[PDB]
Amino acid sequence: KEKAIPKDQRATTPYMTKYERARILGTRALQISMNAPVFVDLEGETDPLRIAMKELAEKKIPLVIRRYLPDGSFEDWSVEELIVDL
Amino acid sequence: EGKRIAFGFVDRTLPHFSKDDYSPESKGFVENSYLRGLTPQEFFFHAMGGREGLIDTAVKTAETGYIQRRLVKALEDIMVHYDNT
Numbered sequence: 063k064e065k066a067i068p069k070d071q072r073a074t075t076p077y078m079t080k081y082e083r084a085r086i087l088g089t090r091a092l093q094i095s096m097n098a099p100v101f102v103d104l105e106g107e108t109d110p111l112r113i114a115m116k117e118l119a120e121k122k123i124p125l126v127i128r129r130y131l132p133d134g135s136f137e138d139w140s141v142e143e144l145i146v147d148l
Numbered sequence: 149e150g151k152r153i154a155f156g157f158v159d160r161t162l163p164h165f166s167k168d169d170y171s172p173e174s175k176g177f178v179e180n181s182y183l184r185g186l187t188p189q190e191f192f193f194h195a196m197g198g199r200e201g202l203i204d205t206a207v208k209t210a211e212t213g214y215i216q217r218r219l220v221k222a223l224e225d226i227m228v229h230y231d232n233t
Contacts, residue, residue, distance in 0.1 A: 074230050129230050130230070131229075131230055131231065132229050132230075132231060132233075137230075
């Protein structure tokens with residue numbers, strides 16, 4: 063647990079890349095398509111990808127991204143606190 | 149090859165000329181047009197001009213392919229990290 067960086071000493075970008083966005087959407091779409099509970103008010107949609115986008119819009123995806131520094135340490139960022147461009 | 153039609157025979161370019169001829173019409177000049185029509189000699193010279201580019205494509209495809217493969221194999225493992233390095 064020595065690798066983990068304290069929250070105050072986080073020196074990575076506070077925006078989320080396109081790769082992280084695509085990975086998160088894919089994971090959430092798979093979990094929804096495997097009958098996982100939905101955290102938002104579904105309105106007439108039957109596609110897991112669109113419901114994943116909808117959950118992302120209200121920032122309700124309960125996932126955490128771990129970013130690997132080259133030496134081996136890592137930095138943990140919640141999906142709620144990552145700024146997503148539109 | 150960047151020059152006018154050289155002397156393929158000895159001291160001329162085609163059996164219909166005379167030795168030591170340097171006039172433009174004898175060294176590959178086409179004063180006609182595609183609408184008018186080409187006379188036989190300038191037709192022959194145009195054919196050689198086209199053959200050059202045909203060869204160019206047909207071989208340098210392969211040479212450029214080899215260079216491209218070597219380049220991509222050399223650099224394939226370079227990535228921007230989170231340190232921005």
